[PDB]
Amino acid sequence: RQINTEYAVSLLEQLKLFYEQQLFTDIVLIVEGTEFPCHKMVLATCSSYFRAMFMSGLSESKQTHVHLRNVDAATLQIIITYAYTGNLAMNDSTVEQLYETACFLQVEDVLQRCREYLIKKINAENCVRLLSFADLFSCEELKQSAKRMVEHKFTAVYHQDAFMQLSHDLLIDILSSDNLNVEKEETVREAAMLWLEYNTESRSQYLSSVLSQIRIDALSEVTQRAWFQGLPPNDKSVVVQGLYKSMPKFFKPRLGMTKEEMMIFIEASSENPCSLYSSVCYSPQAEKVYKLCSPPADLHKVGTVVTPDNDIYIAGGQVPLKNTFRTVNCFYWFDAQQNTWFPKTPMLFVRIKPSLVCCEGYIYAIGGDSVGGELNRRTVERYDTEKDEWTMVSPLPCAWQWSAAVVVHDCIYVMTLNLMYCYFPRSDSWVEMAMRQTSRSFASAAAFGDKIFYIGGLSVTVEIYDVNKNEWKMAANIPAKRYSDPCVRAVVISNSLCVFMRETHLNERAKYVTYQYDLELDRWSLRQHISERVLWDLGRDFRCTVGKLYPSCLEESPWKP
């Protein structure tokens, strides 16, 4: 039995003290002239290479001085600090060299720690770099994660400097995969070309291999003429092998072309009584209802946000204590292919129904019950999508509840009962814009074009605001029925303003129908009526947002018409 109370801590601390005082040392590591007198026992324990270094009978087993090369001394001191105390304390810059030295020394625990740290830090730019790093040092978890991140982002960037310097096998795996998040088939073609234009006459065979990989759909466009311009002289059989890649090799449709603009819904009426709420989706064009997996599977009252790059995030929320609703500041992100939710850096305050707004690539969480007891309650907190951290910003002018916030013209706009403040995204200047003549709450707003459409409130209030004009005006009243309960939802659909409303009467069933609204007509034309045979009841606390999803990755929601 390992008694952790007395001996373990005391033994570890005394070993660390002996290391500090250079006591009972019998082995010293020479690293480019730097001396590291650590002790044989702890070396052989942590590392799986030092045990063979000191146990296997050779000339270095009986050697007081050992000249170990190809290892960094700063990283080696970090390793020996982790070896005398159990604490790694890794930064964000020296992770690559630390992992390389750990792999060379075969230290499993620090290898796993660095693997987890790297798999948690594939943010935006090191994706291709760490993918190449994992290709050099075999790491299945890192390889798969970096491959997915590359298939997600490089398909939208395809210009990274590090991407040019890649091995043939990794590039073939990337290109031949059917996970390319590209809505068009020419971008991958030009990416492959530019990968084969900066290094030509050196990778001509690999040029032919990538040419075959990109396949006929993009091979029949321009590649022949560009290659004729750039081919080496006196090349004949290369023409023969290039001409062959027209008929064969199974031309098939890709997966990134299925970016159907749909609607993501949360907190729906769960089918099985064992579950409370569920997240589902609706297809405006396919006229189908898809489902999504709950991010925590137990926590509710979350807020949604969609970046211009079509990303889904979940922040805040409350979960039942399950003693024998507590608020959690956790954060999550939705995977567009794996149909799962990977968590991210949690917030600093446990918010209830936060309002997340994206601007300048930053996620801004406005209001939503930060803590309540916090003296400064009229406050906000934003997110960094690149650095993966939360930065405090200028607080709210006035404290508001059940508010809504949108982004227009790269500027933060938050709407409340009657007031509105514009927060300069860069100058952090909360300046009052205009005040509504009607006091309505429990409503949301949509940022369509350059006009904010605040719909609903307690109703059918249609108050249109323009940034360039800075004024509030009414347009019309949405066609509703007598004694109805219009749950209004305003959102952009296919670059056209539309609404999604549900009416409820006494002893009557709910009806779902979306209307097409015109700017100059001030009328909501009947666009499409959602049939109850495909979509069932949603509820009251459901939320709506616009985003593109994959039908194959998701699954249809089974429900009897």
Place this chain on the structure above:
Amino acid sequence: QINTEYAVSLLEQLKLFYEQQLFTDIVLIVEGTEFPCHKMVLATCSSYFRAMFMSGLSESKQTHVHLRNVDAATLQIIITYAYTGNLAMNDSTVEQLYETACFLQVEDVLQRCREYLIKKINAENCVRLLSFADLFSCEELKQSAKRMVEHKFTAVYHQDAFMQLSHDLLIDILSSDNLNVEKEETVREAAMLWLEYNTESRSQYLSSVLSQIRIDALSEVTQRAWFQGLPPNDKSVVVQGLYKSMPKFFKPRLGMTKEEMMIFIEASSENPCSLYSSVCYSPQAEKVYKLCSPPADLHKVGTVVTPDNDIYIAGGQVPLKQTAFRTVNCFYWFDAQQNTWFPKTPMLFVRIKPSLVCCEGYIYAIGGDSVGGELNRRTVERYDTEKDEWTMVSPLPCAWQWSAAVVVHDCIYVMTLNLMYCYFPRSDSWVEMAMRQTSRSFASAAAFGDKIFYIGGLGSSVTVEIYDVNKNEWKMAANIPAKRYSDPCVRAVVISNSLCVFMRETHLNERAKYVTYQYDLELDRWSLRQHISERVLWDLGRDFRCTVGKLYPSCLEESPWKP
């Protein structure tokens, strides 16, 4: 803080290396037994190996060291503790464990075995432990041995190891003012028999041992007996002791200051900040001496006084950290001199108001509202005062609540509302006894001679039912004459070889009055033995208990409280 995960990983990897013998460079050669180990672990654990390897001598460099004057098993257990931290300590090898720990100067194992020995000190190894603490310098063990040896040995003075003791240790023991003896002559004869263990090896110490005993026995008998055992023609001792007993004026010791007193627990706290306190009444000094508070204000407990005059506390509940109370099975022992409660081995099950009864040296706790509450919730358990452990006994056939128990004729007699069962320690069985004709509860009984006197019962009353063990029958004697329209609080106890009663009565719109009566056994009448004046004794409460015991007025202090 230091990462505990990496610490335990390092420790288990080092222990794996030790078991597999990979990086061992130094081998300990003890009586032909190989002990392959490392230098780092030995240096970290022991303070002798750090001076053995970091010295610069022959054995410091020799990969083979012949460690002598040690034991193989002790060295093995020390090494395995240094490699994994587990110290399996039994009741036999602790002596050699301490010997090797002192030889190797390992502080952790030394402290662990010191704690084990401070817990293991008892009557049958008191002198041996004191000699061991004299051989190896250990002040804590020496002081605990001093106290326990003084008390138990002055009670017993028959240990075989007492003969083989150093002169300085005996001088310290005999000259101390903490000895517990009813008379000053038993120590005299103990010293005489120790001196007569040898003849000439004790002659030089004869002049010193008599210098610590009072001269009241240095001129009476046991001076010619030494002359009988004197070496022949020795004229430097007879005439020496003839004119030597001028100094050392007779001073009474502390052991002769024990008086029959009534110990009270859970009394009404004079200070309102405290919840319940403990006081004591002096039937002879006519005063109220304060007592130490129960351990962690342990309420709802039971008391017992062994024939050796020892006080114990078992069961009870502590307020959990408005009503809030949690029951704990902690056990404690009261120090008659230090005025403190020394913790002992806790019980197996928690109890509320347990009946502690002593018999054949075993402490019996019958019932007491156990948390178990099973089919046989009437399970009783005895305590071993020799091995310091608890052992279950035959369960009580019937489940009883608010019961009392006494010991008569080497048997346990537990009493309930109307039934009685006698437990036979020899056969571990229960036998049906006589049935009472009155249903009374919440009363106490005192065992005087071979009779059981169940006094009171239900407030209480003046009903008395006397039971005879030899006759096996319940008979009435009389009713205690008390003031009408009152609620007396009867307390049966044995004192001065007679059955007296501690009955506190309260009248209407009047304060409680304290008075004790002497019950005439042959005349069947309660006679006024003494009236307790209210100028010294204040209110105690209702849930207070009383017991018969002896205490030292010198060690205790008078309670400062207004009449």
Place this chain on the structure above:
Amino acid sequence: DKIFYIGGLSVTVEIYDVNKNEWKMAANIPAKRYSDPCVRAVVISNSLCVFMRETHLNERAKYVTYQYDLELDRWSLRQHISERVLWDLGRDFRCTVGKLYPSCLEESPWKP
């Protein structure tokens, strides 16, 4: 010759002068988020000082006195009362300045 009205419901520092007959603000005493500050203003050794205690959620009270300057409008750190000698006081406690005898009085026993 100046009245220093401190606190109120906070850290309001309103200084009044008899010869000038006007109320003015000087500065704010350093207070943290949700720090219940029991301000106490009193004269110490012919120098204006304050005795304040801060309380947070799931946190222990801290006692510290600061030295305030008239022309600086700042409460310089004069002395921090260690909890090893002084324990918690409460909410309705009062403070006043006076001279006493140490021999006649007795030290308050309390575990650090």
